[PDB]
Subunit: 435 residues, 4 copies
């Protein structure tokens, strides 16, 4: 806790993100619909961020597939702005402030996605930059683009006015009341790898703007080689390329959790990415799917929530919330599970063998959480000894998702679990307590 | 197999404005180099007058590009000469008048292009001749050149892509272009070799109805694409940009070794331009500025000798009009040039202790031997006749010196200083 | 004609190799049976080399899977020798000379495989090298092994005794009467790439032994980066990792031939590898198979022979020859087809599109050969215009495998071809 | 991090002496004993306790840092390398290192050895037994795993029956001898195979099964961050870098490696900046581009290195021949005030790095703040840092720890003119 911005995400951010349901193309009405649902059914459980994902500045976006080289909505200072057809309250140069105001009044927080860099249409016209006389063209990198989106060019920190530009972006965002930015094309790039210098300029720009804004970075895989950079400069960073509702990616996440578990801490959260639950693909064609309810089975959905919960990943719901059924809503409203996310710490892989995995973490009151997973293709008993958990005596055991006491455990936990199925258990002391 | 081979039966010889003028050569500088060539060089085979990169960039002024600037372009997305630097191009005539002039001097004309389609055309979605699709419809979304900002790559799968490239070589053919040096096409730090654009270019050339020699740059060309190059291009750069630095000339020896088996009629691995004479007038590359080549006279000869015996294309990179007599002599020795024009089979006989020997032959029995001391120490460099495949004594002649040397019984051997070479002809003794 | 050793392989070497049929484990009697069949049925068609493949020095070899870290027969100069149990004529220190004599007396030539380097056991025991007084241990490389075979360590050309050792190997092989050597762990290596310095040492050693020994390098893929080295130093070098009777490997060879076609020439032959035809996998387990007749369909077997013929690959039969049926023998003995391999030149890919591929070559007699291939998964017409072939008027066309005149062709060649099916056509001037 | 019982074996970063930088592969028993005695006498009160015999104690002809390849090695009947009795006479009679370690334990010190990953090639070639089993060394060897810079072993294949039994047997031996520390080589970086993760785990388990506390050190680096979890959970120490030597370029480079590794430092699991080339080194080593010599590090460089290792909390393993130290060299090892930062400091972080100026800070439980300030440029210059940037909320007492000299009150910032390659180590405490 050396870095002031850690205090802005004491626990891992929880919220909703338009990407998995709406792709690049979410409207004001949809945002607000999801915000209202959150306010009323989710906010008591920690869910507070409402994040407008990529390309809110792209008036014609209608998918997860971007329309390349198209005109973007922009101000007179080379800054992108919301598309007024999609966000009508943005009329009159108001930007996202009205939307942000309405979200804040719900008791909720406001987020946006930005692309690293400065828009290409700005560099080519050479539009001005607020606060300086250099123009957009003079701060652009001559060899730095995003391989999967044509909207921007990279900015070169070595040029006069580079920081001025980033500063000016975060002044705008701060005026609008943004509480959370998800930066893209910054951690992993086929072409260039991690854009470290822009991460630094962005941390600087946030710090200078005077409003607390949580910094999320994307896409992954984040290299461990930049662990220290990430831990000191970002509140979240994506461990993985885009996550979707396919078992192979959920399977894969276990190793990434294992590789990143030691960097997890207050204010600096490796990110397992958004939860493809409920109603997705409405205007997204990504993940090899279209308009659907998540292809994860119920066991898969639990398995994911359980891992993300115990690991302390940010939780960003990715479905259209208003179409949650009760099952889906139950995944988000169980306070006993969420305690593991909010107050747990120390999470670690106890072991992984024959596609059985066990993680454990604890709280400050001496409860110990254990998450046990069968990530194989067959039904099998998964178990762990109390000794391997560091429990030197017998313990009471409770199934947190079912909310049901399991009684006393003297030597080990052991459960028959179908393929892709898990269980999350709380262990609490038996010795020196009532009956 | 390939008809375009007949367009470069011997390796191209010429002049190129890059090393002396960077991106910024004027119509006057070109005219004057061409006039010097017609007068002093044409009899020895020098014929291409190549206008290098960025003739379409009115502001160009160095070897360092001005990025993201507007460029001169027609109404079908095709770049055009900058009228300020090329006054004869006024009124949409492009390069036809300069080329005409050059043709009327008995010479050929070439230009440099960048792979792809101008970024400004894609941004503005300007038309493509012969189609209803626009520039933006044929562009690659993830293809740029890492060291220049002018273009986006073209995506051969899009409708209209080949039409675009066709339309460029229609324009070049209207102008009378005889030679095109394509850039950002062979090696790319980001993407490697742009294979599919090499094929569209080949095809656009073939369809335009005029013989246009195809040169590919920058290198290093990968040996992995040897077939593609041999079959599609007349010349291809073995190396990133060559300059007047010993280390780069030293390095070329291995590259020539590496490529020697793909050298052949119509298809020439290219050791790049000759940074001789007066260079860096408006170029700042190679770690130098306005200067005469930093190669010593020995180094110049060593270079000329390797490029000659290997059969690299020869593109003089200095401002010819500032040649002194030494420099002119390197270009006007017929005996040496015969080795380039009519030699074949060049091969490295050996390389050992930074002594190197190359050999080639003509069809009339003559054997050429180039002997090189690329070490830092004076020494005798020798080679046996037997290792050259000569089974009895021969006569030797020093081709640069034009002097007979006498009978060689067993070995050719000379004292050579560091960086110094000799080129010898052997033929039957009396 | 710059390298004298080019004249040892003026046309692409043709023969039989024990690997595909017997793995590491062939016996003398098996070699002899194959050589007898070759002498009787194949020799006049050009087939002449009888090549004993890897580990003739490993008495317990029994498959294509090597027995690691086991003892190896060796002489008193650190040189591997044949296992007398498998090669009984080698009894009493005679090595392969008696078996080489037998094969020479059938009118045939004799080949062996060797592993690059010097035996590990020789380095550990520090046994002697002939012609010098450093031991084996002093010439070994300290960081060079084969990732897939444990027999040897690499030899370090910077050490005194290194060339002496390679020289001694080729003295022995020449004493034996070896005419061909296939060297392994030398072209491609997952750990180290191409072993160029050993290639040079072996070239020199062959040149010094005073017998023509054709030099074959393996396994691939050969990098184009070393094309000059290969061209000047070897008579054949493998374009590919080990080839087997699997359609996918056959599909993949089309590209490799394209990539190497400009280096094919007299004495220096890019090698598409041994032909997995007939009865293979008797004591081999490679290629995903066991004891079998080739899993290539007849169409695939024709496709392979067609490509290898026109491209001018060496032709090394990998099956047990005595189990050839008539069909299989016919693949090896079509005079008209062999003409393209023996007397053609200039092979090139005319095009490759939607998995249809056309190759062409010619002889000096006026004849142009065109090999047309459907390498797609569906029946389709494959075609090419006389013009794309560089043919300026009507030509008589003949199917070479079928030996059947197809008549006059005025504009193009066009054939319905099954998936994986091919045709080989000669075009000649209209009567 | 607190999960693993072996963390308790290295609560502070191991401190000791290692034979590599002074004697290569070639140290004798008398040299080990001499350095041990020196340690017991002059250094043990400041935390120095490990006496580590480096590589190739089993190679009787060894004579340098350059290995003699493919040579027969001293080995028991169970495929386990044994001390060369010519170099370690007290090992005569199959006693191995027990006598030597007993000697060192009696000085109140701890004993360390170096091992190469794997099983000896000669064991595999002869197919010598694996203790406690009916399998042979040949049955457990990998057929494609070697060290690119040493020929002594083949890798062990964890999937083979007996593989774990072999490693268990090694650590039974080492425990019998009384070994307290093992430096394992050819395990973290390999130009040919990368990190040998499965052998790391076999070794962890063998140690856990042997019944004695044995500190696990891994080498050589660079250790990839990609395996940070593995190293943190399985080892007490792991090399950040390839072998470190008395050259400035290598010292300069370590600054970035510490920056990269600083979040994985913690009780029981210490990223290692490698042994300290101080004093008399290169006596039977030819590595580092040097020969027999006193270290080529200037005093400033020596301090700069001590200071970064101190504040970062790298283990400290002296690589010179201790009996030849001067008072200067000794003074680097005996300053309690500096060592408190290594022993009791935590949270070490780079405050910033700019124009070859670097500042690190850490703190202790008493709210002292330690700050190390480095000029790693080629120019003399003033290096500074604000107390705001140190997160010191108000004015502070300052003290130069190496000089042991109060600097008085500091209100706004620390600033010092430092030579090139020169550093200072300061402690800030609350005022009055
Ligand atoms: O979730 C994805 C993310 O990886 C980003 O970089 O680009 C678009 C979406 O926001
Ligand atoms: O000679 C250089 C060449 O390498 C090319 O690629 O770019 C511009 C110049 O023409
Ligand atoms: O044909 C294979 C070959 O590729 C070689 O490298 O080793 C074994 C067989 O001889
Ligand atoms: O210190 C070096 C170390 O890096 C090891 O890997 O090899 C021998 C020495 O102990």
């Amino acid at each position: 806790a050396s870095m002031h911005h850690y205090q802005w995400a004491k626990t891992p951010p929880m919220g909703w993100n338009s990407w998995d349901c709406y792709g690049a193309s979410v409207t004001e009405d949809e945002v607000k619909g999801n915000a209202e649902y959150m306010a009323k059914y989710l906010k008591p459980f920690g869910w507070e961020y409402v994040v407008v994902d990529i390309q809110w500045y792209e008036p014609g976006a209608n998918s997860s597939i971007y329309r390349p080289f198209v005109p973007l909505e922009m101000d007179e200072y080379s800054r992108l702005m919301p598309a007024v057809n999609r966000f009508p309250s943005a009329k009159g140069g108001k930007g996202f402030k009205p939307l942000a105001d309405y979200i804040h009044n719900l008791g909720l927080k406001f987020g946006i996605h930005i692309m690293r860099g400065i828009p290409r249409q700005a560099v080519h016209q050479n539009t001005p930059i607020l606060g300086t006389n250099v123009g957009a063209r003079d701060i652009a990198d001559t060899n730095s683009i995003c391989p999967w989106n044509t909207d921007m060019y990279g900015v070169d920190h070595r040029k006069e006015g580079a920081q001025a530009y980033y500063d000016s972006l975060f002044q705008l965002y701060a005026q609008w009341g943004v509480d959370f930015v998800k930066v893209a094309d910054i951690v992993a790039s086929k072409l260039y790898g991690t854009h470290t210098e822009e991460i630094k300029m962005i941390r600087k720009a946030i710090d200078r703007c005077g409003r607390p804004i949580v910094l999320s970075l994307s896409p992954g895989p984040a290299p461990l080689d930049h662990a220290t950079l990430f831990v000191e400069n970002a509140n979240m960073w994506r461990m993985t390329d885009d996550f979707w509702d396919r078992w192979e990616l959920l399977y894969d996440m276990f190793e990434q959790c294992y590789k990143w578990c030691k960097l997890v801490g207050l204010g600096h959260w490796p990110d397992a990415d958004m939860l493809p639950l409920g109603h997705i693909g409405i205007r997204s064609v990504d993940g090899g799917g279209t308009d659907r309810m998540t292809r994860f089975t119920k066991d898969e959905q639990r398995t994911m929530m359980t891992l993300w919960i115990i690991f302390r990943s940010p939780l960003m719901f990715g479905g259209e919330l208003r179409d949650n059924d009760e099952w889906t809503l139950s995944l988000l409203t169980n306070e006993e599970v969420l305690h593991v996310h909010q107050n747990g710490y120390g999470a670690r892989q106890v072991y992984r063998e024959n596609d059985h995995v066990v993680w454990t973490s604890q709280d400050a009151e001496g409860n110990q959480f254990v998450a046990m997973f069968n990530i194989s293709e067959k039904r099998s008993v998964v178990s762990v000894s109390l000794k391997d958990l560091g429990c030197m005596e017998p313990m009471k055991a409770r199934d947190l998702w079912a909310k049901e006491d399991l009684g006393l455990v003297k030597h080990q936990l052991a459960f028959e679990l179908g393929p892709h199925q898990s269980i999350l258990v709380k262990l609490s002391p038996a010795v020196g307590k009532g009956l």
